[PDB]
Write an enzyme that holds these catalytic residues in place. Structure first.
Site, PDB file in Angstrom:
ATOM      1  N   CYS A 198      25.225  35.461  43.084  1.00  0.00           N
ATOM      2  CA  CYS A 198      26.401  34.856  43.694  1.00  0.00           C
ATOM      3  C   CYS A 198      27.343  34.215  42.687  1.00  0.00           C
ATOM      4  O   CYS A 198      28.365  33.654  43.090  1.00  0.00           O
ATOM      5  CB  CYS A 198      25.975  33.809  44.727  1.00  0.00           C
ATOM      6  SG  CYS A 198      24.872  34.436  46.013  1.00  0.00           S
TER       7      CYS A 198
ATOM      8  N   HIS B 274      30.648  33.640  53.090  1.00  0.00           N
ATOM      9  CA  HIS B 274      29.957  33.782  51.814  1.00  0.00           C
ATOM     10  C   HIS B 274      30.133  35.216  51.330  1.00  0.00           C
ATOM     11  O   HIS B 274      29.616  36.155  51.942  1.00  0.00           O
ATOM     12  CB  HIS B 274      28.483  33.417  51.965  1.00  0.00           C
ATOM     13  CG  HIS B 274      27.682  33.590  50.714  1.00  0.00           C
ATOM     14  ND1 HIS B 274      27.909  32.848  49.577  1.00  0.00           N
ATOM     15  CD2 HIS B 274      26.643  34.409  50.428  1.00  0.00           C
ATOM     16  CE1 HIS B 274      27.051  33.209  48.640  1.00  0.00           C
ATOM     17  NE2 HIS B 274      26.272  34.154  49.131  1.00  0.00           N
TER      18      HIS B 274
ATOM     19  N   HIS C 212      30.763  24.935  45.711  1.00  0.00           N
ATOM     20  CA  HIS C 212      30.018  26.050  46.278  1.00  0.00           C
ATOM     21  C   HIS C 212      30.030  25.983  47.800  1.00  0.00           C
ATOM     22  O   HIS C 212      30.486  26.915  48.471  1.00  0.00           O
ATOM     23  CB  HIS C 212      28.589  26.054  45.733  1.00  0.00           C
ATOM     24  CG  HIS C 212      27.903  27.378  45.852  1.00  0.00           C
ATOM     25  ND1 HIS C 212      26.828  27.591  46.686  1.00  0.00           N
ATOM     26  CD2 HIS C 212      28.148  28.562  45.244  1.00  0.00           C
ATOM     27  CE1 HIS C 212      26.437  28.848  46.583  1.00  0.00           C
ATOM     28  NE2 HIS C 212      27.222  29.459  45.716  1.00  0.00           N
TER      29      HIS C 212
ATOM     30  N   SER D 225      79.717  67.619   7.896  1.00  0.00           N
ATOM     31  CA  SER D 225      80.859  67.071   7.171  1.00  0.00           C
ATOM     32  C   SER D 225      80.547  65.672   6.658  1.00  0.00           C
ATOM     33  O   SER D 225      79.946  65.510   5.592  1.00  0.00           O
ATOM     34  CB  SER D 225      82.107  67.053   8.057  1.00  0.00           C
ATOM     35  OG  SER D 225      82.865  68.241   7.906  1.00  0.00           O
TER      36      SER D 225
END
Lengths: 923, 922
Positions: B182, B358, B318, B650
């Site tokens: 995770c 989650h 978390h 030229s």
């Protein structure tokens, strides 16, 4: 509180200290692997027994098993795990694995090969970068669609491969899993090197694993075209090449910074100078190589390493035996390596893939192992299966020379050099530059000291020592395990090995060293031995279960730390601490420091009396010398990693106790002890006649005394030695009267004929002078819990407040000593181990009595030096006992630092009891 | 070669310049995500119509699935992929793991959001660190182990998720897939940072992705038995907490070194300062969170950033919503972040898991969006599902305070700070700290214009400011990888520009937005002044009908351009002066060569350009045209153009010498003035018996070699075309052939020139030409020269010096082989010719010659003209160079953008998808 950014990550070389292999036919040790390489072996076989036995059903899969090219490298005993070693239940141990078994076992083997105790890394920043490629056991994890099983997520996950390793070994460092196809091991090593360089971890375990579980991947590899060899062998850069074959195995490497490996005195096998990794873009096709990409990898790797790619002596190549990949690899190699080679200094080719096969994600590990071994054995393995140089490669146009027979190292730049390349089939290329160990990375970049007499007596004593017998030193053999049965079996194996010719030819010290650099498990045992026969007898005793005079073996650690009993009431013997001064250096240094302090304080030198064997002792000199020896013993113990948990001190053994608790410092303790001793000296020199006191060890308790002073009110209590006995001191008349009473009451009594009868009434005049002297010491916060026998035995908690003031040293000298109450309070607080630091152990009997009355009969009394004993052996025995019971002691610090591979022994390795742990999976 | 141990790595800060999103609810750009976050939307839904539909066939697993915790953040449209866009076939595309498709699409979306064209990153050091924790499509793809397809190893694998991204976009940098459960995303980002700090990459696409394909993993994750909430709403740090639910969807981040972002011009969305990652060790098993590790990650992260953790504002955490883990995370936070807070300072806490669920491996990707988006809009979003503080964690005790309503940013200690934490279920922990963009990190002899030049420039600026402003011509550039896609994109953009938001947007902003997008194979450009012209041009592009200002092309032109440096009589009164007044690079180079010409003869050409009264003599015209050519070419090269082959005529040879690498600047100036002063002196002293009058005639090489014995002193001067030729000689033999050709049927247009060159008349002059070309160094050319001095034969690049004194001696005497050189350019593939003079006169000759040689689709691009606004002309030429497929950097056509108002929300690129899925027999 500093928060000011870390700092730059300096580019440094990364040492390699350990290595372990489980190759598909090069065998399971890095000494069998070297033998197989040097001889030249082939690990390719057919499907052993039933390995797809599970998918061998579905009778059509059987046809395509016998239709697809199924030869290759296989590894015997994939199913196997010592689940009680790794603390996994039977219901769990079969849902794990099989790549995690290999990872867990290979970490152990690599740590054993590196000779670092696996128990010295628990709770340390150790990174674990492991490279895996495939998840195929998860198929077996779900085979019956009528039930479902827990334990399956953590059992067959891919991240959890590198997490379990960090879990079991308790590693607090970056733990990740890597996936870049056929190059996973090399990129894992590269990331481990990067992690070490920027100071995220101190030791890193790197490498890779691979296992072949299902024929589905092999079948898929078959239906790509001509990619799998009909023969089953791989001929890299040869005239013949028709594909590779897939093998299983794994490798691991213990990486450490070179400065760390020098400081910790480890043996460096080879250093990694630098590495690089990239991709190849297009690459017309996902699985088609590129030339400029691989040349970029080579250039970036060799600029990271800081070397010139044209001084490289050997190149271990990818060499997957392809008619198209091999020319591309050779051309890319020759564009960078073989650019300016003067036609007589060619780079040697050679691929390990011709011995083991293609190892997928573990491939980069296998090659690395070879390049390390050839860099330590100073040889070069030959590449098998080579027929002749390929038509599409112009070898002499480049500087490529494919070796065929074992050569020696062509050091084109002085030192050996090599490069490992690995290219994945997704397009990820890696290249690692591996050097050889070099001399540059094994070498680093007032007080009145001893007098002039001391030199003369020391010089005489050293010659006298050098004019004696050749004594046999005492060596501790330390065996250890996590259980008891394992310890017994290991002791039996070590005893057996010690009798064979290799064991007999090995020096005892080398065996002790090799044993002291292993894992220190929960169950421990130590055998102190002088020769091989004593060691064998003791090891047999350990294996059987019997006891022995000098063999210790316990079952589990003692929960509470030791208690240092700073004793020394009647401990002198005329040769106090003379042998240890000559034959040990830390002891001598600490003794001389104390001598300088005492010389400053009183004027004379303790060292003179200690070394000389002419002058006898007296209360002043006795006290100061005992204190000095106590300080030296304590510092010798703490130099090897010993730490007190509590400290108790009796009488003169009080000041030293202070120094060991953080209640004073060495100078203050010296102050106190010298002032005290001088006071008793002059006092006992004066007080006689109408002031004479005495001492008596009467068998009266604390209460039987409370009814016995009525007849003789003028007696007092000196020391409460035990709760059966007690020292009394008072007037002479009443003293002999109490002796007569004890004789007629069934009580043992004995007079101590000592002038300095302290702690009773003779010190009443003296304390005033004491107040004049000790005033000026600085007590601090006690870092160790003191059992103050002066404060009646209260467990003064660490860190509370200074408790060592002038009154404390006055009251303790004046009033009685409460030794037995303090010991009783200690045994009631948890402690079971007592360590007495005295020239002659006399207080352990009192401690034994007090602890016996207090209920605990199986204590641990550990004595220091004694009379008519070899002091070095006594110290060794004390430290061995400390190691056995479980307290803080670094067993590795006993044996001196080694020099080479001849200072260690080939002691047998650890064994696992492997049982078949497999899942029943019907497809 | 030098090999000297690449230096150390310096701990610098990493800028975020782009961002993507495929979270539930906000299935699109990070502007729907911001709306959903600031609204408090809930993305947690039930099982879609058919999600699994494969294992939901057996009536055994069907019941267990129907009796399981199967609610979560499910995404719509998992099976749709744009195969043709990503160049893969059909049978290959049904195998490809949906995670690979998601990564492929999200990388494109991130590169669009960062406003960096994908085609500009081809074959450079671009690292690709992608996190992915499962491949459950291997179950479906490698099911039926009997007749399974070949492509399953390359297709549905895990090392290939990042490798396909590196492959398709042609990234030559470290590509790796990461697996730490995770924390994977937050780990990958972290590793990317380290790469950018040690020099192994320049732009890093780091992120994560996750997808739910099989219920077996879901049903297994349900096991243990008390971690899946009944309903599904993750209630974090609340009294109620009954578990969490699974989700799908990923996210990418385009990371750059802050120095690179400052130097290039991208907008810094946020700045990562530090990151750390470690492991729990052994606490109570794998799935047991340890607190001392979770405090150690914080300490290491905030010592790596150099930031005191007691000044952070937002602690996006978390927030797994478990009844036990959340208190542990709380103590971990309070030990480090909230330790010593002076009691107001409530360390605002929040979680993104409460809105989307989650996301497993993509979790660190979700939070890194929420913290960045908020940091870009200066307002914290609310965090839903917070009934009340949990009994076990004392919020007010440590420093904590949950946020419930849209809240402004506390700014303790100065700027805005933050922190993102992810804690894997295997034990891996990562913490990354993000700052706010700061005032720092965004910031940090040859004479010129003479006095007379200064005065004339002041007068010219007065005149310029007298007239009012006119709408500048703006090029809109549409591109795609196919003709049909380009047509559709043009149609959609026109429809957008008919809308009110497309009517209140400045054309410059629309052009700027369109210039920083992927430049594909099919290209088209519409040059417009106002909105309606642009709309009509876009409709023409979509329909396919041609138009004056509309250019379109189906595929790139193979060979490189040819810079036709020529011009005879292309001068006029006011050439090269308007663009000198409205462009500074051109002016700078004009003055740079003006210093040199002042050194050479006696005077400044810039004075002639400024003043409009000067009478352009032959010498002055020659040097002025040389200066104009030099400035034109160097302005074109300043924008990234590169000549592949040059050919002079030229007085066009002198500038071709400098533009081919054969000479330096002073060499070309010396050559041009050595020519010019000599002709200027010589022409005046010529009279009736001496003038070699040049006139054009319409006789080709054979038709003059035939009739050449009739006319003795006539001679070839210029081979101009396979039919025309300029001849020179004594006047009577000129007039005789003119008059005879008039009756024959030829064209005898006569030149009124007087310093007639390419004649035998110049032999007297060559004596001083010999001594006035000494000291120059001919050098190995950097590209091929189709020299007209040496008959017109090709010269290979990187050879030997050519333009020596003898070469110019021959050039001033012998005939010009223009037509043969042009035909030789035709021979070797060349199709595009670009003519650098203030008047496209040589283009007619080149057109006739190319028509002769069999090119009728020949791209002839004129640069400047007369009676045409010069800046518009240059924009047209450079847009044409872009169109045909040559090397022009179109992003340099506009100015540096000072903010979001300088861009325009043009419609995004479209992916037309189809359903790619495998049989479901499992």
């Amino acid at each position: 509180e500093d928060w000011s950014r870390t700092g730059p990550a300096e580019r440094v070389d990364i040492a390699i200290v350990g290595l372990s292999t489980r190759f598909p036919g090069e065998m399971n040790t890095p000494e069998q692997t070297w033998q197989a390489l040097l001889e030249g072996r082939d690990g390719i076989t057919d499907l052993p027994d039933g390995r797809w036995s599970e998918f061998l059903e579905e009778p059509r899969l059987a046809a395509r098993v016998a239709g697809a090219r199924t030869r290759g490298g296989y590894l015997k005993d994939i199913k196997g795990f010592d689940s009680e070693f790794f603390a996994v239940a039977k219901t769990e141990a079969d849902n794990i694995d099989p790549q995690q078994r290999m990872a867990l076992e290979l970490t152990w083997e690599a740590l054993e090969h590196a000779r670092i105790p696996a128990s010295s890394l628990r709770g340390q920043a150790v990174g674990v970068y492991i490279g895996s490629s495939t998840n195929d056991y998860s198929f077996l994890a779900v085979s019956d669609p009528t039930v479902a099983h827990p334990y399956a997520i953590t059992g067959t996950s891919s991240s959890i491969i590198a997490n379990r390793v960090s879990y079991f070994y308790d590693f607090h460092g970056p733990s990740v899993t890597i996936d870049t196809a056929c190059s996973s091991s090399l990129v894992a090593i590269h990331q481990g090197v990067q992690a070490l360089r920027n100071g995220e971890a101190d030791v890193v375990v790197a490498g890779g694993v691979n296992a072949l579980i299902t024929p589905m991947v092999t079948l898929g590899f078959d239906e790509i075209g001509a990619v799998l060899a009909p023969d089953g062998r791989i001929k890299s850069f040869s005239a013949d090449a028709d594909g590779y074959t897939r093998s299983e195995g794994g490798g691991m490497l213990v990486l450490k910074r070179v400065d760390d490996a020098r400081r910790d005195g480890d043996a460096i096998l080879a250093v990694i100078a630098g590495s690089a990794v990239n991709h190849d873009g297009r690459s017309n096709g996902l699985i088609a190589p590129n030339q400029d990409a691989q040349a970029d990898v080579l250039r970036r790797a060799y600029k990271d390493a800081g070397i010139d790619p044209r001084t490289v002596d050997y190149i271990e190549a990818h060499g997957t035996g392809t008619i198209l990949g091999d020319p591309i690899e050779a051309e890319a190699l020759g564009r960078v390596v073989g650019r300016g080679r003067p036609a007589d200094r060619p780079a040697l080719l050679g691929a390990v893939k011709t011995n083991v096969g293609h190892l997928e994600s573990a491939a980069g590990a296998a090659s690395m192992a070879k390049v390390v071994l050839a860099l330590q054995h100073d040889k070069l393995p030959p590449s098998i299966n080579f027929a002749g140089p390929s038509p599409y490669i112009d070898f002499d146009a480049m500087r490529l020379k494919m070796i065929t027979t074992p050569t020696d190292w062509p050091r084109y730049g002085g030192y050996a050099l090599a490069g490992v390349s690995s290219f994945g089939f997704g397009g990820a290329n890696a290249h690692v530059v591996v050097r050889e160990v070099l001399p540059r990375d094994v070498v680093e970049k007032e007080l009145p000291g001893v007098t002039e007499e001391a030199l003369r007596l020391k010089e005489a004593a050293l010659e006298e020592l050098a004019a004696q017998e050749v004594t046999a030193p005492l060596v501790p053999l330390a065996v250890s395990a996590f259980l008891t049965s394992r310890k017994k079996a290991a002791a039996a194996e070590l005893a057996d090995w010690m009798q064979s010719p290799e064991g007999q030819a090995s020096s005892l010290e080398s065996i002790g060293r090799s044993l002291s650099r292993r894992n220190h498990g929960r169950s421990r045992a130590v055998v102190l031995a002088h020769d091989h026969d004593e060691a064998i007898k003791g090891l047999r005793a350990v294996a059987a279960g019997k006891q022995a005079p000098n063999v210790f073996s316990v079952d589990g650690p003692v929960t509470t730390g030791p208690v240092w009993v700073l004793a020394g009431f009647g401990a002198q013997h005329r040769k106090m601490g003379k042998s240890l001064y000559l034959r040990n250096e830390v002891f001598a240094a600490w003794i001389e420091k104390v001598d300088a302090l005492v010389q400053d304080e009183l004027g004379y030198s303790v060292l003179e009396l200690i070394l000389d064997d002419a002058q006898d002792y007296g209360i002043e000199t006795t006290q100061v010398t005992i204190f000095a020896i106590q300080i030296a013993l304590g510092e010798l113990l703490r130099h090897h990693g010993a730490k007190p948990a509590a400290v108790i001190g009796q009488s003169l053994g009080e000041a030293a106790s202070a120094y060991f608790a953080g209640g004073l410092s060495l100078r203050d303790a010296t102050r106190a002890i010298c002032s005290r001793s001088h006071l008793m000296g002059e006092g006992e020199a004066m007080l006689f006649g109408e002031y004479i006191r005495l001492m008596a060890l009467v068998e009266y308790s604390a209460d039987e005394i409370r009814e016995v002073f009525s007849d003789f009110p003028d007696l007092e209590v000196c020391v409460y030695a035990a709760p059966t006995q007690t020292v009394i001191g008072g007037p002479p008349e009443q003293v002999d009267a109490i002796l007569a009473r004890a004789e007629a009451e069934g009580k043992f009594a004995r007079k101590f004929a000592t002038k300095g009868a302290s702690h009773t009434s003779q010190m009443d005049p003296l304390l005033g002078e004491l107040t004049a002297e000790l005033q000026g010491i600085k007590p601090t916060s006690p870092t160790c819990g003191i059992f103050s026998t002066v404060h009646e035995g209260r467990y003064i908690k660490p860190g509370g407040e200074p408790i060592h003031d002038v009154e404390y040293w006055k009251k303790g000298l004046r009033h009685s000593v409460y030794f037995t109450h303090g010991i009783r309070n200690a045994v009631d607080s948890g402690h079971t181990t007592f360590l007495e630091l005295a020239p002659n152990p006399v207080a352990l009997m009192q401690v034994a009595l007090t602890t016996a009355d207090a209920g605990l009969h199986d204590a641990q009394l550990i004595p220091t030096l004694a009379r008519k004993q070899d002091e070095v052996s006594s110290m060794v025995s004390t430290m061995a006992q400390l190691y056995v019971y479980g307290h803080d002691l670094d067993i590795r610090t006993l044996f001196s630092r080694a020099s080479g591979p001849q200072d260690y022994a080939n002691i047998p390795p650890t064994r696992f009891k492997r049982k078949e742990h497999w899942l029943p999976a019907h497809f």
